Amino acid sequence: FEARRPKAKAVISEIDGVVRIEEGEDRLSVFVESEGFSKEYKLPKDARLLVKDGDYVEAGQPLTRGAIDPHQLLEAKGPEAVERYLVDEIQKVYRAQGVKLHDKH
């Protein structure tokens, strides 16, 4: 509700690229490169990523596990998916606890 930066924050692609895993036994970095673009992502060897090498990615798609920063995916995927993930998580915890309520609210 406060759109605060997650503690466990997970990285997300900024475009629709291809995946390239690169690990020099220091930093496990995963590049995401398009046809006319490219950018890498500095990632720690600890948190396991969700995308296997060579795979195709989508805009704002999560590369690693953990909560997604609201503003981050906002300027990536779009406002549509934003609303979605927001309410989806709130209902995640609420439904988990065993309290049902309409999404409208």
Place this chain on the structure above:
Amino acid sequence: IVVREADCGTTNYISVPLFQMDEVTRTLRLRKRSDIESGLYGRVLAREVEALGRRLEEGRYLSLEDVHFLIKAAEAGEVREVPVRSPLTCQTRYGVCQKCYGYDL
């Protein structure tokens, strides 16, 4: 936020699939009853709906039986997406509308 215009007059909407993909299990599954019941009950269709031979007129309000029918229609595999008027898409300014809101619970 107050209901002012009974109809804002927008065309926008959001679809809400009844299928939430199970993680580590891959294969998609139907959102258990309470989940769907909490999203489609007291709603208003944004567009026409065809499946199982019965037709849902655009602008038809939903009740328990309605959402249950959609559930069955999903299980049969005739529908997945659910076009509805959301409080978000609502163009009512400084408030909301009827069609975009729903049933007074």
